[PDB]
Each structure stands twice: as structure tokens, then as C-alpha cells.
CHARMM-style PDB file with segment names, atoms N, HN, CA, C and O in Angstrom:
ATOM      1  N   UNK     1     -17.762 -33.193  -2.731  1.00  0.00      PROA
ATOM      2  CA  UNK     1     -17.586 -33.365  -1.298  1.00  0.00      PROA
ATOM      3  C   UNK     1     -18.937 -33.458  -0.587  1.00  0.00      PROA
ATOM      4  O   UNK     1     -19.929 -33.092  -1.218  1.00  0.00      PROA
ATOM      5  N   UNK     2     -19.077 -33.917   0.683  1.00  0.00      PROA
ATOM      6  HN  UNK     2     -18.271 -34.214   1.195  1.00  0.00      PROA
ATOM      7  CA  UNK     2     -19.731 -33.755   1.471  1.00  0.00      PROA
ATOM      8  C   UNK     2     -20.815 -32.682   1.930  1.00  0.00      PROA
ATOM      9  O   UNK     2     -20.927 -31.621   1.316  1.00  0.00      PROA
ATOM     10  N   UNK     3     -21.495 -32.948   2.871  1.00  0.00      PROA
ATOM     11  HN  UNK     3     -21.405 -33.810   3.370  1.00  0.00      PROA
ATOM     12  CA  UNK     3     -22.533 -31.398   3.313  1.00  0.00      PROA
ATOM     13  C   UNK     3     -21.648 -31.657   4.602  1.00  0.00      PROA
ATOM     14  O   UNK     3     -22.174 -30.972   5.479  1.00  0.00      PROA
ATOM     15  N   UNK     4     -20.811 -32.165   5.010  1.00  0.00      PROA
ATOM     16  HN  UNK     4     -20.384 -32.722   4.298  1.00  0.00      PROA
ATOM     17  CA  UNK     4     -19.910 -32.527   6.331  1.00  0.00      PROA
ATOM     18  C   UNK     4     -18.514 -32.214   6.160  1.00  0.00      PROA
ATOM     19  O   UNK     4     -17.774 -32.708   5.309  1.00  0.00      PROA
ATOM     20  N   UNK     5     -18.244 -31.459   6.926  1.00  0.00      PROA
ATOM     21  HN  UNK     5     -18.845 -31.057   7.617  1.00  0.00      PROA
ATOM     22  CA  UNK     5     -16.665 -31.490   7.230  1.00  0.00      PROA
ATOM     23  C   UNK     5     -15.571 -32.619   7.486  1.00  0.00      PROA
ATOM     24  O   UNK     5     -15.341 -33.001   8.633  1.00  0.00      PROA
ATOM     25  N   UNK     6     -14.973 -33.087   6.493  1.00  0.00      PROA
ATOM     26  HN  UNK     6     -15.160 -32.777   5.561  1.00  0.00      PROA
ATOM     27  CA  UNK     6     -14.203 -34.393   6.099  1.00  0.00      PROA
ATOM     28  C   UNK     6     -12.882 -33.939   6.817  1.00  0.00      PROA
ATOM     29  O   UNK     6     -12.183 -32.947   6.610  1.00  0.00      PROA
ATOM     30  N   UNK     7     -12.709 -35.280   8.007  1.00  0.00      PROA
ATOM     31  HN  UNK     7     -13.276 -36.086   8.176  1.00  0.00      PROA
ATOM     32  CA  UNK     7     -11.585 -34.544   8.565  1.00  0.00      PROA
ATOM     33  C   UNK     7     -10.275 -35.145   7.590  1.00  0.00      PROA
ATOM     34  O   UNK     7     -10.420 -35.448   6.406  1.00  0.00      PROA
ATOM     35  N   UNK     8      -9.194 -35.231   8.218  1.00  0.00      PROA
ATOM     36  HN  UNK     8      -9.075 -34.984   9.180  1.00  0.00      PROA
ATOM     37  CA  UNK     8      -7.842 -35.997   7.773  1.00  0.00      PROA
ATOM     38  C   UNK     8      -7.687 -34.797   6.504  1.00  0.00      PROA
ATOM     39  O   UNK     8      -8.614 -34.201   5.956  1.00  0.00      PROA
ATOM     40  N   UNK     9      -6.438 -34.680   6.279  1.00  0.00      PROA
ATOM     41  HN  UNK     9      -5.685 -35.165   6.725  1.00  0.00      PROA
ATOM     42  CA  UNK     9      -5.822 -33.543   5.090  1.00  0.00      PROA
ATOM     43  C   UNK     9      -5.245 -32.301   5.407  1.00  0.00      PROA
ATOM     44  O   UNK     9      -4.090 -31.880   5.470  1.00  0.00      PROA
ATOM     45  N   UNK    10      -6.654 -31.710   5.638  1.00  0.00      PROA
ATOM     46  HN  UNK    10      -7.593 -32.052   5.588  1.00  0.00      PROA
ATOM     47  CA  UNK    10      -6.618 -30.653   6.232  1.00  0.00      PROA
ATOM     48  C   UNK    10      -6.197 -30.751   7.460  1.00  0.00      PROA
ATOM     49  O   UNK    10      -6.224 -29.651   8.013  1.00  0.00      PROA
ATOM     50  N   UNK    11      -5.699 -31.861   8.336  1.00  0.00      PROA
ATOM     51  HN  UNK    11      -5.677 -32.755   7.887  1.00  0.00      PROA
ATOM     52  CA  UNK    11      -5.687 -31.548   9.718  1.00  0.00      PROA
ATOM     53  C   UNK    11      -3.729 -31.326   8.879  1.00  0.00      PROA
ATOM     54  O   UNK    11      -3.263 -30.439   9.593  1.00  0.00      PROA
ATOM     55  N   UNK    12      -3.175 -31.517   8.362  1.00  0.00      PROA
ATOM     56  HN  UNK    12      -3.554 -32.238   7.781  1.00  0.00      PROA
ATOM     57  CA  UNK    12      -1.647 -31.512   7.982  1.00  0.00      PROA
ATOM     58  C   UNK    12      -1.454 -30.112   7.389  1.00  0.00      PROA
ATOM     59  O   UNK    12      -0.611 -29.219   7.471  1.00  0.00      PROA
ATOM     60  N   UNK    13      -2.782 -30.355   6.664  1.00  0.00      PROA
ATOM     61  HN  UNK    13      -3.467 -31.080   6.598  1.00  0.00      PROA
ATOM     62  CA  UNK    13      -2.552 -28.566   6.153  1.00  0.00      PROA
ATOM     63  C   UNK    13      -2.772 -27.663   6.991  1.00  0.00      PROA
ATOM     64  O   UNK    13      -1.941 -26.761   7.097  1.00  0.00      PROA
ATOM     65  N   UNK    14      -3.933 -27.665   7.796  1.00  0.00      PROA
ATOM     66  HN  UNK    14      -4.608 -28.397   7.710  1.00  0.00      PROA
ATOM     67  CA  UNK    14      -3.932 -26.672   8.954  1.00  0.00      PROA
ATOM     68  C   UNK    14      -2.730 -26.614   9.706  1.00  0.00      PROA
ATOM     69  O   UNK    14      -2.379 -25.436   9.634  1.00  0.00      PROA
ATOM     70  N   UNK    15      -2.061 -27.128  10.261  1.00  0.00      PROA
ATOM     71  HN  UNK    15      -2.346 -28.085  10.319  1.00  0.00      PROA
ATOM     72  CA  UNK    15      -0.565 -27.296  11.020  1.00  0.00      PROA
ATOM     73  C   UNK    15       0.216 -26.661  10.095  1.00  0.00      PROA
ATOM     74  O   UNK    15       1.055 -25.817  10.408  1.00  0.00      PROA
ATOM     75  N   UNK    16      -0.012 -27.023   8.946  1.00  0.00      PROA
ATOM     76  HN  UNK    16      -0.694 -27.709   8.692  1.00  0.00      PROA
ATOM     77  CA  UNK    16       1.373 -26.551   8.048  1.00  0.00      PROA
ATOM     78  C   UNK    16       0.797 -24.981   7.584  1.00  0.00      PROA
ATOM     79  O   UNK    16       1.561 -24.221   6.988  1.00  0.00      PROA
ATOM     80  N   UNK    17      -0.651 -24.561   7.921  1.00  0.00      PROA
ATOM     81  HN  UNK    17      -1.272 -25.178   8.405  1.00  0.00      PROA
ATOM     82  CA  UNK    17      -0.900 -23.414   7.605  1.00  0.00      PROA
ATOM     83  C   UNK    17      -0.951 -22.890   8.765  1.00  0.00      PROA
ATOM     84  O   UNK    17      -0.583 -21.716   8.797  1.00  0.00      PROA
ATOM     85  N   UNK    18      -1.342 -23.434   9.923  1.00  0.00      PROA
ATOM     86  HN  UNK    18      -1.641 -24.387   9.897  1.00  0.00      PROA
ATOM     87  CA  UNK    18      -1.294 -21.939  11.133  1.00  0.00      PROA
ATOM     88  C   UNK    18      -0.256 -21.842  11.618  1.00  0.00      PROA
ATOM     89  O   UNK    18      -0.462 -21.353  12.728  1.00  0.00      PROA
ATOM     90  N   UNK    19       1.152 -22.063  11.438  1.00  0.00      PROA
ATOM     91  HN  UNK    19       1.320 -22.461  10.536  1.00  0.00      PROA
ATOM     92  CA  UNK    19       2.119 -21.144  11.246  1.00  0.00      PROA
ATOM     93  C   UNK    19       2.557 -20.344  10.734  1.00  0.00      PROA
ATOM     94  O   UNK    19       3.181 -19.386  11.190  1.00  0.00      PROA
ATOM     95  N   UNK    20       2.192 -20.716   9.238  1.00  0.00      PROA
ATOM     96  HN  UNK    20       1.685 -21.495   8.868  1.00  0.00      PROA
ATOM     97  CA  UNK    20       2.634 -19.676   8.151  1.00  0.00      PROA
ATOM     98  C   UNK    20       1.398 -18.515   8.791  1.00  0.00      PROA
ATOM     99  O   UNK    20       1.960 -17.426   8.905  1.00  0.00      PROA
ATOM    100  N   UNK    21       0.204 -18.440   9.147  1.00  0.00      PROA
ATOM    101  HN  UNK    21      -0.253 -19.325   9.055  1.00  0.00      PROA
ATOM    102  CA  UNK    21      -0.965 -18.142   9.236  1.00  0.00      PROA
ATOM    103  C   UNK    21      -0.214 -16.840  10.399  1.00  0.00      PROA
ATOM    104  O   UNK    21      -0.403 -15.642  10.608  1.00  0.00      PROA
ATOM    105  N   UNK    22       0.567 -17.764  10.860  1.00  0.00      PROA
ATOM    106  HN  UNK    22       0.721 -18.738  10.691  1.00  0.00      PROA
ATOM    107  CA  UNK    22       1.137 -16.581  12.045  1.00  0.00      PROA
ATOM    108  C   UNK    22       1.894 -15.622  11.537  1.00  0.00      PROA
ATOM    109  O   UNK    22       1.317 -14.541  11.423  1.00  0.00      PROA
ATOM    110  N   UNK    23       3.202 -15.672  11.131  1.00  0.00      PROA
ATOM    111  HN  UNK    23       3.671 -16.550  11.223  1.00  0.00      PROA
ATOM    112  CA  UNK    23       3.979 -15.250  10.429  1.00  0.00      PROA
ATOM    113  C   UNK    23       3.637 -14.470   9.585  1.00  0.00      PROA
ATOM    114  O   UNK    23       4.139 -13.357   9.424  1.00  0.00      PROA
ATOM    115  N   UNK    24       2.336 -15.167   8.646  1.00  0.00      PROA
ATOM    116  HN  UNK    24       1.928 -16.070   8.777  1.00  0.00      PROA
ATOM    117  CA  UNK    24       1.738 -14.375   7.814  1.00  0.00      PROA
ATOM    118  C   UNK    24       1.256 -13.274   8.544  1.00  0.00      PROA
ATOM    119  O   UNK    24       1.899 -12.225   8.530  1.00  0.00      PROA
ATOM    120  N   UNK    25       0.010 -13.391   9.301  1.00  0.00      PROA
ATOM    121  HN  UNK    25      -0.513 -14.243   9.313  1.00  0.00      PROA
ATOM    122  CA  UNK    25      -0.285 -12.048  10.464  1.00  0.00      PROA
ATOM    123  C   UNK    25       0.526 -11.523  11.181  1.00  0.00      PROA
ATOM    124  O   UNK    25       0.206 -10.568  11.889  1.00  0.00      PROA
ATOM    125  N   UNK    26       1.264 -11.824  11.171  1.00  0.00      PROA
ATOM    126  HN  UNK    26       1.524 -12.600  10.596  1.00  0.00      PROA
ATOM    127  CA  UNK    26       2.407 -11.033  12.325  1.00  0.00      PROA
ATOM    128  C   UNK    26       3.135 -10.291  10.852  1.00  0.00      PROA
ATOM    129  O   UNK    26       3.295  -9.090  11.068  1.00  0.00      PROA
ATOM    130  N   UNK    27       3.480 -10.588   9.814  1.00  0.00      PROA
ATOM    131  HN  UNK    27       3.350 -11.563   9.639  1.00  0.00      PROA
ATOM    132  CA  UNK    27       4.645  -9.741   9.243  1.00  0.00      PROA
ATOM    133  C   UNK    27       3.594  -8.708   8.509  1.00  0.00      PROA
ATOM    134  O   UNK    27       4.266  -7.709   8.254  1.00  0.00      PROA
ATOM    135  N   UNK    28       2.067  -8.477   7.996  1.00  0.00      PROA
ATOM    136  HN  UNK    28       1.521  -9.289   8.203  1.00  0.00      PROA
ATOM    137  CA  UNK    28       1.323  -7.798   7.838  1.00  0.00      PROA
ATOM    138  C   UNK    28       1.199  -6.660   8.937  1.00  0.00      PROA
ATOM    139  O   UNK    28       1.393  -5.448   8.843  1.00  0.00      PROA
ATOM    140  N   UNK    29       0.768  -7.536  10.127  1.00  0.00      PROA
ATOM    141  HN  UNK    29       0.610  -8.521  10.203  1.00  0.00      PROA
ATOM    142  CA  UNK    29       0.225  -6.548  11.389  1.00  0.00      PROA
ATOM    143  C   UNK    29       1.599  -5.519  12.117  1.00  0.00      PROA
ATOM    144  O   UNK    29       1.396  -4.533  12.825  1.00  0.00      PROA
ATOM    145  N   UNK    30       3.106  -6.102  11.690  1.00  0.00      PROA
ATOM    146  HN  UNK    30       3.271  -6.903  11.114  1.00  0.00      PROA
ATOM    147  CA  UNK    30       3.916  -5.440  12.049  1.00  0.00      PROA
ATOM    148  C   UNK    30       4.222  -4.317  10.856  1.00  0.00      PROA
ATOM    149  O   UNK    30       4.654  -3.175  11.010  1.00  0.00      PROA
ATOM    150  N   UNK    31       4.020  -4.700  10.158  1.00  0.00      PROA
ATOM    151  HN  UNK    31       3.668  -5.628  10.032  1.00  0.00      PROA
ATOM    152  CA  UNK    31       3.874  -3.977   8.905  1.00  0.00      PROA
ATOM    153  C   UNK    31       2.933  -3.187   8.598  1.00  0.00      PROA
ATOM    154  O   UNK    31       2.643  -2.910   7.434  1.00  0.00      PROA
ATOM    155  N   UNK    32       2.203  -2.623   9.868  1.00  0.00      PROA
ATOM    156  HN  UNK    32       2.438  -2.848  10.814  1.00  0.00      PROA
ATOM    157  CA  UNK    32       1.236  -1.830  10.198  1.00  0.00      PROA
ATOM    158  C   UNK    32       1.496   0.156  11.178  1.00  0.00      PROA
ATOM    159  O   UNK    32       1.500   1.345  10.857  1.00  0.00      PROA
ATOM    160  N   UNK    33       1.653  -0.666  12.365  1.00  0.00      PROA
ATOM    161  HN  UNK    33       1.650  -1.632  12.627  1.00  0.00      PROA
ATOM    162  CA  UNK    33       1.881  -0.260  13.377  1.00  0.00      PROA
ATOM    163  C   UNK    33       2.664   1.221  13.085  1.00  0.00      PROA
ATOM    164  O   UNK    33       2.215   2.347  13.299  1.00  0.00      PROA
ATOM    165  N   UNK    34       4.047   0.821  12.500  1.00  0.00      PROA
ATOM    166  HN  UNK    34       4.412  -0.094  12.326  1.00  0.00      PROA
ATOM    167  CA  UNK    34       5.133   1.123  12.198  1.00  0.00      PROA
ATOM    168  C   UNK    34       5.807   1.145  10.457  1.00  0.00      PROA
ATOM    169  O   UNK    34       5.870   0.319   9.546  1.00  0.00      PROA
ATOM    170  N   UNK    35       6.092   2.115  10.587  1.00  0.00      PROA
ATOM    171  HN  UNK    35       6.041   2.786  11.327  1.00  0.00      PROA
ATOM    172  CA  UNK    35       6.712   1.802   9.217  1.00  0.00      PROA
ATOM    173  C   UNK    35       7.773   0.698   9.002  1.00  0.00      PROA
ATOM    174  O   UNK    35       7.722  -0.230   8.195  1.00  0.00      PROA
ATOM    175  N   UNK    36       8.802   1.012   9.947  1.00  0.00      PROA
ATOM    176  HN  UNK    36       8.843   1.766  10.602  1.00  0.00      PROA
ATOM    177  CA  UNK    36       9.859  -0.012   9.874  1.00  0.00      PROA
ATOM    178  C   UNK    36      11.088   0.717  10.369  1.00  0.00      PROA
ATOM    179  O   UNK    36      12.108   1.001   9.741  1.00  0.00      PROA
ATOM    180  N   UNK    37      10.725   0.997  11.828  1.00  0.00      PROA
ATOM    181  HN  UNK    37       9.896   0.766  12.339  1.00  0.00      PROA
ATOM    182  CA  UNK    37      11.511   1.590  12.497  1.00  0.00      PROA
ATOM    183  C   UNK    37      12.458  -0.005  13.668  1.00  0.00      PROA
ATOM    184  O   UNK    37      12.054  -0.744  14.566  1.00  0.00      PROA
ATOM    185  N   UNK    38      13.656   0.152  13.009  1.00  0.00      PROA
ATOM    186  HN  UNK    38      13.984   0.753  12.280  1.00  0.00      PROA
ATOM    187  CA  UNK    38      14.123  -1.499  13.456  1.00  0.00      PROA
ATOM    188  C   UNK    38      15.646  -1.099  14.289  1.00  0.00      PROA
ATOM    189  O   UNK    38      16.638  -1.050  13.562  1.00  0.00      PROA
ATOM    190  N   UNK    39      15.797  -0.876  15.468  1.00  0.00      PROA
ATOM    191  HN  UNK    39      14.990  -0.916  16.058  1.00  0.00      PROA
ATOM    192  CA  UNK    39      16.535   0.348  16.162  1.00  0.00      PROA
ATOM    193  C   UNK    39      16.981   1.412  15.452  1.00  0.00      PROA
ATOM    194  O   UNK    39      16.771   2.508  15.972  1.00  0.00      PROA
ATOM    195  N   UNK    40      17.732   1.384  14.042  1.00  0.00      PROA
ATOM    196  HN  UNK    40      17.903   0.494  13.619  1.00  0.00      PROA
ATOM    197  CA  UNK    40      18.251   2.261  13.527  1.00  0.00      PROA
ATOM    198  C   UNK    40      18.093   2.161  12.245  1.00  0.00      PROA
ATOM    199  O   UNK    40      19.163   1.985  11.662  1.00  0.00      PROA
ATOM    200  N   UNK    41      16.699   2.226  11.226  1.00  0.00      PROA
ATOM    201  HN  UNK    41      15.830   2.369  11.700  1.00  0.00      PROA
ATOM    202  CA  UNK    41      16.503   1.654  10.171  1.00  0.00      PROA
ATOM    203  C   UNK    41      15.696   3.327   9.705  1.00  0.00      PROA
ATOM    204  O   UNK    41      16.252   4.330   9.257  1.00  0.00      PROA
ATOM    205  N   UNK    42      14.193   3.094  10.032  1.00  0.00      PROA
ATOM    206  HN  UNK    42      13.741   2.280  10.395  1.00  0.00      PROA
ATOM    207  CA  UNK    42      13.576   4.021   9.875  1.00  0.00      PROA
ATOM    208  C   UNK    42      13.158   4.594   8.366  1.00  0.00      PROA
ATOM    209  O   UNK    42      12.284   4.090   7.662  1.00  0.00      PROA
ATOM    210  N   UNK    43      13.867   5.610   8.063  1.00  0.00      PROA
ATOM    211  HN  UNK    43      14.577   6.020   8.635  1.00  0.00      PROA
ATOM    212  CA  UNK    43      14.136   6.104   6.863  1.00  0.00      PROA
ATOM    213  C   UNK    43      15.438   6.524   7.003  1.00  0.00      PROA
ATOM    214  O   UNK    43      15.566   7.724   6.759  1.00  0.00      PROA
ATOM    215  N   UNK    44      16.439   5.956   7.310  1.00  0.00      PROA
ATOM    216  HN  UNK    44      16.335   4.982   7.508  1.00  0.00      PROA
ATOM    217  CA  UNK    44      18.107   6.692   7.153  1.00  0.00      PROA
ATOM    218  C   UNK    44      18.733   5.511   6.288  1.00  0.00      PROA
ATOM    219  O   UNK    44      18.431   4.326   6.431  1.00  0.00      PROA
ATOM    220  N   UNK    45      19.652   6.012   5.367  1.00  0.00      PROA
ATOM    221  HN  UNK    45      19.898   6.974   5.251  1.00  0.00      PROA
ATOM    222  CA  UNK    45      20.481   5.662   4.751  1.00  0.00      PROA
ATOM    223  C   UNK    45      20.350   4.950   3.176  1.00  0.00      PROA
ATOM    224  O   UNK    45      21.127   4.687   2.258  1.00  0.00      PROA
ATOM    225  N   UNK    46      18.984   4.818   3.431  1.00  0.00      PROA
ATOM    226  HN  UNK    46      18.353   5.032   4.177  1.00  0.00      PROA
ATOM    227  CA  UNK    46      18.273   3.935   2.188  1.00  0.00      PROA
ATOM    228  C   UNK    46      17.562   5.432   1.436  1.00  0.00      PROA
ATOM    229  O   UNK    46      16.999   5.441   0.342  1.00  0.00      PROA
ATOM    230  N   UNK    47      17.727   6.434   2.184  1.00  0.00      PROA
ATOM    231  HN  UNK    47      18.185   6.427   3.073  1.00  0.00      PROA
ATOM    232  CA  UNK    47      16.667   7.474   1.839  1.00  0.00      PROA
ATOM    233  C   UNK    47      17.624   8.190   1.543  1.00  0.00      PROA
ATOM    234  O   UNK    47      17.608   8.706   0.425  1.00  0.00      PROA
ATOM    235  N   UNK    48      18.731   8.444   2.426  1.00  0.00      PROA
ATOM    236  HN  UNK    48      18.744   8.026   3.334  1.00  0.00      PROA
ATOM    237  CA  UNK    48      19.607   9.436   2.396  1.00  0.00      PROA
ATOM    238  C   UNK    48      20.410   9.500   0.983  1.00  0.00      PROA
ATOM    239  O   UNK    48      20.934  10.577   0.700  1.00  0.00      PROA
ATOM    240  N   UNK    49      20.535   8.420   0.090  1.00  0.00      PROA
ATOM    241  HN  UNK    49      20.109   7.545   0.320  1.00  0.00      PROA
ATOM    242  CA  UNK    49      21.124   8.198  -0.928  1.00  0.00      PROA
ATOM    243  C   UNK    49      20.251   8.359  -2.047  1.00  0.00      PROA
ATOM    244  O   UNK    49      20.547   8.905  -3.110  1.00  0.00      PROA
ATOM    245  N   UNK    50      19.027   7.787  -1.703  1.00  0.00      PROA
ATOM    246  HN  UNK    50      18.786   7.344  -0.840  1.00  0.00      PROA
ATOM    247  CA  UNK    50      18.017   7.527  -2.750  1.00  0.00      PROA
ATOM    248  C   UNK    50      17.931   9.422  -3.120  1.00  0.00      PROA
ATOM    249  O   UNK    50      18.149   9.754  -4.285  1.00  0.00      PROA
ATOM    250  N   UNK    51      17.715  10.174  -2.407  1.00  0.00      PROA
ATOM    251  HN  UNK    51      17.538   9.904  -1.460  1.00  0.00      PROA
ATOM    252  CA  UNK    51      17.522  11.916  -1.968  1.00  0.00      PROA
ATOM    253  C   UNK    51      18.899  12.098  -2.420  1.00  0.00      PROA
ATOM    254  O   UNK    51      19.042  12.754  -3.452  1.00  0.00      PROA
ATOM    255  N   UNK    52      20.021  11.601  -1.793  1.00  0.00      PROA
ATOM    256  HN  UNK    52      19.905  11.068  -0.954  1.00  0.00      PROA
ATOM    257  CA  UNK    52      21.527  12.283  -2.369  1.00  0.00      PROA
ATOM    258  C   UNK    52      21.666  12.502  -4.108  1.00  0.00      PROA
ATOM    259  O   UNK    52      22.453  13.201  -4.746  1.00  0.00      PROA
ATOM    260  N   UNK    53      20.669  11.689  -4.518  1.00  0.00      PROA
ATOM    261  HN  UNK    53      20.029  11.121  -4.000  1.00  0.00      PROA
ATOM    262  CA  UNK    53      20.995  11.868  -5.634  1.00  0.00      PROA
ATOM    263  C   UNK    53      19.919  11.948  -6.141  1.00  0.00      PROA
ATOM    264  O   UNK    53      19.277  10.973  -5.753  1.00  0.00      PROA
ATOM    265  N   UNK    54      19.037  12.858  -7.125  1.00  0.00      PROA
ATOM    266  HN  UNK    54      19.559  13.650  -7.440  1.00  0.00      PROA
ATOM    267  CA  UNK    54      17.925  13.440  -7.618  1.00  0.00      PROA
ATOM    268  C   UNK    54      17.440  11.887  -9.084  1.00  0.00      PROA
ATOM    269  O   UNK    54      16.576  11.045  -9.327  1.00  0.00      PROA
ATOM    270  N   UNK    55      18.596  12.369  -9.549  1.00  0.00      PROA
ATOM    271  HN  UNK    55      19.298  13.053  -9.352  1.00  0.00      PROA
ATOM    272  CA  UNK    55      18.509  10.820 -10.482  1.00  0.00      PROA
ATOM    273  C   UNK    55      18.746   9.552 -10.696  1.00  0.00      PROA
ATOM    274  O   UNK    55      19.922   9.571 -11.059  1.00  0.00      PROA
ATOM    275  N   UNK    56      18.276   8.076 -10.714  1.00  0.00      PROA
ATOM    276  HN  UNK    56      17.321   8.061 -10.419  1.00  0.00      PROA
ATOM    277  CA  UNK    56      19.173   7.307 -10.866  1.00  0.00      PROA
ATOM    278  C   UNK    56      20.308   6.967 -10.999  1.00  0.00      PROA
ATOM    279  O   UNK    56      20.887   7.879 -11.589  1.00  0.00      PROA
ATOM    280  N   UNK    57      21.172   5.929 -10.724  1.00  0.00      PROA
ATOM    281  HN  UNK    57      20.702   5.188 -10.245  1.00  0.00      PROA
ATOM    282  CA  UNK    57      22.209   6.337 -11.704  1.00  0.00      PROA
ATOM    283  C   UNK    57      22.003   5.383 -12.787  1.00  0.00      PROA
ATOM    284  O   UNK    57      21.653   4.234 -13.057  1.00  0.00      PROA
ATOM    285  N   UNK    58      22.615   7.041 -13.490  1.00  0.00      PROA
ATOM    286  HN  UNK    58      22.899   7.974 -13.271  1.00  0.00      PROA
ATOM    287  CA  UNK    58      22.553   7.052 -14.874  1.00  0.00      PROA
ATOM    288  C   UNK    58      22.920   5.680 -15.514  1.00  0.00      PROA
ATOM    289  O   UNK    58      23.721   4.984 -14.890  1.00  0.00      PROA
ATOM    290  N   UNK    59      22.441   5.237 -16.646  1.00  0.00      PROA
ATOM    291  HN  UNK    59      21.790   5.803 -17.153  1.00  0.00      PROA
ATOM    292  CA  UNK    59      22.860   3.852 -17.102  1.00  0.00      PROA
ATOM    293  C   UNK    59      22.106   4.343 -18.556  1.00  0.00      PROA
ATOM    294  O   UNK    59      21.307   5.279 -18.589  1.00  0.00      PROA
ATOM    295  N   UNK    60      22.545   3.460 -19.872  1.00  0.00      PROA
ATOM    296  HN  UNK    60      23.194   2.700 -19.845  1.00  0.00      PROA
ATOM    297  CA  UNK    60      22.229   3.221 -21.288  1.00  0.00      PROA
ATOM    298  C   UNK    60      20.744   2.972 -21.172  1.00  0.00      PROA
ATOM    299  O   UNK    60      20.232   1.854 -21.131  1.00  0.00      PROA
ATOM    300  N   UNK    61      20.258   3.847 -21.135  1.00  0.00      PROA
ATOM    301  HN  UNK    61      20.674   4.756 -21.169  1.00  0.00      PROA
ATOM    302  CA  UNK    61      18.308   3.092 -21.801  1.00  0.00      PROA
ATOM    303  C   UNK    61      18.137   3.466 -22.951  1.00  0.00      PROA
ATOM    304  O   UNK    61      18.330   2.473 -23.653  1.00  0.00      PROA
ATOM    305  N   UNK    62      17.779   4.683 -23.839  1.00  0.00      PROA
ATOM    306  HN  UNK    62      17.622   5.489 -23.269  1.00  0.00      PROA
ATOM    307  CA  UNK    62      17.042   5.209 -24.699  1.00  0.00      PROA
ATOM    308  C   UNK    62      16.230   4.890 -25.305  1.00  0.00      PROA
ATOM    309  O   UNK    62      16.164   3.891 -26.022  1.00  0.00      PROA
ATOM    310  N   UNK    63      14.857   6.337 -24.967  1.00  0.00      PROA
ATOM    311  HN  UNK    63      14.911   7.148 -24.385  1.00  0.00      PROA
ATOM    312  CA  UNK    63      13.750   5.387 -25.455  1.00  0.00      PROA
ATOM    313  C   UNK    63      13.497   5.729 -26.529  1.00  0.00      PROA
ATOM    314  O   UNK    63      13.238   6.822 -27.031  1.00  0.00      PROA
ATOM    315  N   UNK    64      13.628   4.103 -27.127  1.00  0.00      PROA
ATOM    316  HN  UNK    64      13.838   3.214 -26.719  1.00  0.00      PROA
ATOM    317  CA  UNK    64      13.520   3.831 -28.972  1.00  0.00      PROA
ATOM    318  C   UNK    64      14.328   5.076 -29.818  1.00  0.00      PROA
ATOM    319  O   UNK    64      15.203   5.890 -29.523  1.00  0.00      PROA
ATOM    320  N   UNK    65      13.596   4.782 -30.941  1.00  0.00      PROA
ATOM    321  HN  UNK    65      12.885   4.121 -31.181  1.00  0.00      PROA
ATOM    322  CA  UNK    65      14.257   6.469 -31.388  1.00  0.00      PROA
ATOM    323  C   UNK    65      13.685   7.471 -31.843  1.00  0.00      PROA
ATOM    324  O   UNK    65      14.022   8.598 -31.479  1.00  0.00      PROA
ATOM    325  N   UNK    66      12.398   7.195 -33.007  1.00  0.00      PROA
ATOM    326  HN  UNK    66      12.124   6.280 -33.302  1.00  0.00      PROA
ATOM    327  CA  UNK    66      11.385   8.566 -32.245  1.00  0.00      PROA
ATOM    328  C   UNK    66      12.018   9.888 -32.745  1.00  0.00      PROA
ATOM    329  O   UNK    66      12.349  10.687 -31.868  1.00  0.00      PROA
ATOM    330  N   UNK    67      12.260  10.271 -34.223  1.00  0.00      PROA
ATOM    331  HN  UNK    67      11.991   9.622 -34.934  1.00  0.00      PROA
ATOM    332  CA  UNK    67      12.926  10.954 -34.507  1.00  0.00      PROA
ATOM    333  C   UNK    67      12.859  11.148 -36.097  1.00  0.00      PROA
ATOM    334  O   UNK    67      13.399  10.330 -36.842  1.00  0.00      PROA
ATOM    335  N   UNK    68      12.142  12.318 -36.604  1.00  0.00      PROA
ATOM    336  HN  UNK    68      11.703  12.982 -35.998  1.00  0.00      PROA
ATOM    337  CA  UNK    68      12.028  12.314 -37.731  1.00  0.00      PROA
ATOM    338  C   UNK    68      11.736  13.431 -38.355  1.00  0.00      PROA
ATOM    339  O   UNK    68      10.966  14.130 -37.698  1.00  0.00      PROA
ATOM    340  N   UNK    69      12.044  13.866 -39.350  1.00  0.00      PROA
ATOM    341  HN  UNK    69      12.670  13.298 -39.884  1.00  0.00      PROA
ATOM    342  CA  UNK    69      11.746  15.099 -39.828  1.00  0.00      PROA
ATOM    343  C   UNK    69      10.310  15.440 -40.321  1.00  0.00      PROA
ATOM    344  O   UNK    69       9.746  16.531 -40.240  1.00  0.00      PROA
ATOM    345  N   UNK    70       9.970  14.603 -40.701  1.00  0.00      PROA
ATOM    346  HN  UNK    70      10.428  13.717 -40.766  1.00  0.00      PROA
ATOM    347  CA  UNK    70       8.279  15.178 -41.723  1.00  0.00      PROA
ATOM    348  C   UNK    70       7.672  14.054 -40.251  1.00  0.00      PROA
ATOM    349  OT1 UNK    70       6.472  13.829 -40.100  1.00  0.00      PROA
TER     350      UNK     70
END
């Protein structure tokens, strides 16, 4: 390239990036402020369950088997 700033390209990509550019800063910078208090979000109900219950639920994993006498 150039020692000059080559216009045309970038002028489509810039458009098509300073929106996302917004969006992008805006869902970071709101994602700041606040945890994610969204009238009635906060930490209720996603927490209250996750806490209702100490363990996953339970499902088949076992790890490997790991089991031997000598």
C-alpha cells in the first residue's frame, strides 16, 4: 500500500463498521455500569435455582475408571 490513505473500501466498511462499532460500544459500556439489572432481571430466578440446588443436575458422567488394586 501506499504512505497515503487510499480512499474507496473502507468507506463501505467503515459504514458497515460504525454501527456494529456502536452496538459494539454500547453492549460493552452497558455491560459495565450495571450488572444487568433489566426491570426485573438482576440476579432473581436464574440464581434462585442455580442456589436452589447445591448440585447440578445430576446426569451420567464418570470420570474414566481409575480403579485398581496394586
Amino acid at each position: 500500500g501506499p504512505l497515503v490513505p487510499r480512499g474507496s473500501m473502507a468507506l463501505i466498511v467503515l459504514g458497515g463498521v460504525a454501527g456494529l462499532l456502536l452496538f459494539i460500544g454500547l453492549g460493552i459500556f452497558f455491560s459495565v455500569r450495571s450488572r444487568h439489572r433489566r426491570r426485573q432481571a438482576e440476579r432473581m430466578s436464574q440464581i434462585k435455582r442455580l442456589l436452589s440446588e447445591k448440585k447440578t443436575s445430576q446426569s451420567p458422567h464418570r470420570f474414566q475408571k481409575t480403579h485398581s488394586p496394586i
